[PDB]
Symmetry: D2
Subunit: 315 residues, 4 copies
């Protein structure tokens, strides 16, 4: 028995997080002890410039290249890693671990976090126990589900947290103790199939706050947007002028999801917004940016609010 | 020596939080043991409909009626209580405690939180030790500064937290142990004087996220808005199309503040956005809705970015 | 079809949490809308006086009375609710929901939390979706697993949190959205059978801190204790004098578990304590009081350290 | 004007946190850009072996060497850094910044945190704005007061948090934005003078939990201990057998402080323990290990419970 190591594929979307993509193994020599790593640059953007085209590219590349590898690590900027992770959570049909990883400090800074995050992302992708848990994010010693994971602090290396349901597992000395898995349907259990798409439905986000102008919302309407996500106040409430515009849009063919600017907690049914009455959809624990991801994919399949709510209740 | 009680004024902005405003003392009989309470309905709105006119009304009423009372408790909806609290923090010149209070459960529900929150808000307003600390929010046994306080959860009675610098004090058996006070200048130490205003500068908020449309921003520009606040990704980064529109607006007379959709942590100077170069202002720990409050008031005094940054560094 | 309600049994261990046990339904009339409630006083203690005899009594009563009811709610003091919940998690063989509930404010105080907590505990016990999740604690709108749940604050109504892995579900308008379940084996999947015991193995807890005396530990040894749990510093380290006494006890027939005074995070293997070498057991995420529960039950089955570690790796 | 740098003194208590003490400047070359660093090894222990003698040594060395330097950084193990920081907070009379720093990962590990923590500790010690704030801990980009700071997680680099009152400031690009300072009296404003002591009063900690044995407590009594700190359940309650022993000890010349095993929140007066009646002292937000520090120093000045409570109300 040759003691052989998993084949792990690193897909890079941006700059390096340790220190080019072919060189990652010399940046972090301990990688060669836990996997056989192949690197490919897919794109080279800053994740604040993340977009629908890169999401389609990643989902098709992983889906196409699933047989060629034992698992995937995606290097991504931290700003939108929580959006890409959820998109891939819903669209990846490969049944091998996909793990996203980033760094909150530059690779050339004192105590750069990139290198060890990358080690732990590879450990996670290599661990047969990581399978069947959806698309993961690995940051600061912790394995996080792609649905709940979010950036909680602007600068902290410990910023990534599953703020509503907690992490799946912690990583110590290259081993994971998993104690949870996401109940919401992901990966091969969703009907979201993007293999044949080169665009996604147009979904935009508007913010609520005292004195909020109806103009951003009206611009998305006037633009024909397929859906709008409201970053509501409190339990997904809307400023009277925004509510008026969205209530009109919902009765004239625009899908409307009520989310919350509030960083934890569900936008529920049965609070101060009669959703049945307005044709609205409640986002549950999906924050605006995540709610947008699911609304875009819900729109690839249905324009019916009652069917979108069911999708927001299951994924 | 007649053992006399402080005179406390309750200003109501909405529905009751215990159970009309004249009746609050029968809703919470223990009030009569700690103060002499007078109630006045100032407005009756849901706080998701909160606006510039109500803020002007409250600041002038407190400023005008300062001599008539020992302190103020304002009953307010939870959705925008963190915006009103910061506006009053910057605009109140009365040197007597102003405390804001709300309820996360209806007054008629099981275990309604309104009644005890109201008791604790009155205790806080009555406590000579509460003076000189700015405008406060009292929720869930805790005294919170108006600057840092925010709603962290959609439904939890413990939702209000000073997420960056912590609470000022905790409330047990009608006494407060204060261990902190806000360092940022407030109340009588700000130059913000609204006594003679009946409108505020037009300031709107745009959200960043993958594939973000430039259309909301362009609508605020086309509308002549005095300022725009960016709910950035990560450390106040902007999606390339939003950045393009805001960079143009900043060089053509629109004040632009970079904040973060990220619920804790500063939007700093000296990260990936050269603010000097674009004429932008970094919001620091001010979240978008709070950053809007300070930008509106900064605009009552100056249109100069470098002077707005100094204001964002001091208040 | 008569629309019939579940039969729910309330077992009381102490004073009332709403407002005697037969009267709970008049204290909270909305109960009659979701269940048929029967009350029994099992004991009447304050939970700071909680002990092995009450744990045996509850596990046998639930195990014996499983067929007679659709589920159980146990009213318990908050101080040790996290210990009883874990003991019942490991020892209950009934496959019907057992939910523990308490109150952080007296039933006669303003905004008493007891009543709604009790409503939500009954909702949880009634919900067929609550089955197969182990023994639960329901506090502040949240369903918590008995293993991870702990009291994080001395006075806050939101004190109960699953600080390492998060809650199982949130409770809104009498419905639960479950998104997690505990992976560690519980209830019918443990070998812990207490049906025929009237005592438990003697297990005590010692605290680490600078200058810590070896005398508490030596008193537990001199007393013949079957095991000792160390409330370690950091990653389950011990003060040199405590370590000396425990290292001696471990080689002379005393089971020794290293836990942490640190309120989150695992006491891991492979840090600064060679456990193999000392015959010690690492507690993982079990805090001292929880680690004691599992060590006591591990000792009903085995005295072998290597077998106790396996038990601490599986339950 | 030669642009000169502050003189900063590093006092080491253990192994290196970057990579001997004279070599720290080559381990972290950016130090030479912000200070003139001198290193001295005072002791070389692991902080789980921290003790009264090292505390006396550090307080006298800083007090004696105050004139010789612009500020101090102390390298310390993380396990007991929160105890030493509070002892120095109460005993240091130097009016120059003393900052404590540690590392949660070994200096030779991937992404070792030591180096940047050390940079930030020096920045903090160098910053004239750091003066008059007490003894500080600097970890993970954050400036923390010595009183409230505690280790919240066993392994996380972000473990150090001021869990009750928040941090004093955050550190970005070598600058601090301070927004708070501790209200409790520290450093030169305490009467604790240890200049002439070579021992401290004997103070031990006992843990509460279901079925807790009275034997640890009895061993501390039988040993003549000057005080005992109770790691209570909930709001500093005690298991009936522990309470009996402590109630006896308090009436026979042993100082007894009720703290809480609960990791946040005050052990209050006026809950379920009549402190006046038992001659007990409530620890407030002081956790057991911190409460021990203040009780030991309170005992250098007074044996009177009512005077110890006043000390626990002011420091």
């Amino acid at each position: 028995h040759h003691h052989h190591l998993p084949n792990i594929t690193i897909l890079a979307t941006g700059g390096t997080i340790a220190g080019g993509v072919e060189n990652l193994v010399n940046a972090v020599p301990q990688l060669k002890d836990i996997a056989n790593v192949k690197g490919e640059q897919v794109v080279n953007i800053g994740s604040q410039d993340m977009n629908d085209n890169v999401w389609l590219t990643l989902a098709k590349k992983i889906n196409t290249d699933c047989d060629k590898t034992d698992g995937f690590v995606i290097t991504h900027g931290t700003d939108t890693m929580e959006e890409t992770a959820y998109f891939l959570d819903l669209t990846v049909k490969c049944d091998k671990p996909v793990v996203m990883v980033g760094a909150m400090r530059p690779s050339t800074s004192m105590s750069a976090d990139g290198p060890f995050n990358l080690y732990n992302a590879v450990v996670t992708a290599a661990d047969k126990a990581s399978a069947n848990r959806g698309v993961l994010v690995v940051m600061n010693d912790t394995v996080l589900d792609g649905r709940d994971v979010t950036k909680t602090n602007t600068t902290d290396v410990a910023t990534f947290k599953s703020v509503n349901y907690g992490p799946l597992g912690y990583i110590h000395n290259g081993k994971i103790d998993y104690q949870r898995t996401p109940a919401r349907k992901h990966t091969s259990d969703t009907p979201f199939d993007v293999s044949k798409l080169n665009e996604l439905p147009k979904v935009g986000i508007v913010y609520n706050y005292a004195n909020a102008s109806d103009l951003p919302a009206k611009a998305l309407v006037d633009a024909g947007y397929d859906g709008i996500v409201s970053a509501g106040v409190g339990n997904g409430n809307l400023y009277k002028s925004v509510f008026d515009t969205l209530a009109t849009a919902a009765k004239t063919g625009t899908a409307v999801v009520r989310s919350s600017r509030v960083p934890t907690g569900a936008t529920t049914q049965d609070a101060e917004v009669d959703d049945a009455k307005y044709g609205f959809v409640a986002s549950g624990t999906l924050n605006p940016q995540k709610a947008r991801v699911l609304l875009q994919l819900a729109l690839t399949q249905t324009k019916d609010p009652q069917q979108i709510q069911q999708i927001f209740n299951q994924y």
